[PDB]
Amino acid sequence: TEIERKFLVATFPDGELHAVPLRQGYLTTPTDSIELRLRQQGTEYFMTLKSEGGRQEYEIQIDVTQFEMLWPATEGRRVEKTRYSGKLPDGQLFELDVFAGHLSPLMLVEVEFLSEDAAQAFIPPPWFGEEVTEDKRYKNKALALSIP
Template sequence: MAIEIERKYLLEAYPEDLISEGTIVVEKEQFIEQTYLALDGDQELRVRKITDLKSGQVEFTHTFKNGWGIAREEIEFAISEGLYDQVVKAHGAIPLTKRRVTARLGNTIIEIDDYAQIHMLVLEVEFPSMEAADGFVPPAWFGQDISTEKQYSNKKVWRDLQQQAGRES
């Protein structure tokens, strides 16, 4: 099982100025619909529909994650549109949606997730090791480090959406 090591930051505003001046170079933009199929403690099973906003290309993934915080086990693989549609329809849940911008900030790849349903901006940085994650010094504009704050986790936000809609999660 692969280990995903990432830090997350709560952005106060989208960094338009840094993009327009070339400090941040946008590589791709995607629209992601994410639905959780099962949640148990620190384990999660989810599916995603990912649409590339430039090309219109769509991919579907199925992901298992285990653990909490900065480093977690992750298995992700592609699934067919038909399988995705079946499990989402059978589950009947409201997907968590976000616009993801993947960009370069110097030698660092960043992902900015804009959650329109809940008016939240989160910036993620993935690392090859815990040492790299621990040694990372973010620019001040990254905002609060929320890497270990459960209230900002995708699964918590998704559960809240289900409860607001009167659905079980």
């Protein structure tokens, strides 16, 4: 399991960034028997089925037409954002999300660490905002289920 900390973003960074637009959305609500999620990852499209009272995750790749026909059934349970991949001066990789639609102006930065004490030793750079690693509200599903 990866080790990571997540922060608000105080200032968008300069430097080398790779941008990927992302759109992801739930067809189901958390109390359903299964979780069915649609995602677009750049140029490819997937539908994922998970069941915890199922074995146990299924993923099918779908085409753009299948995706856009079903997308409207995700309304109100969606996260759309552009994700920027970069690297801090010390070499830690980061992923910086700039959220679209009603989640604007949220921006989040997530950092991955190789030792789970490089993680505890981490000194955030000044462009990072407040840490939200523990805040339940900033988890992906929480963000998708929040409302305008």
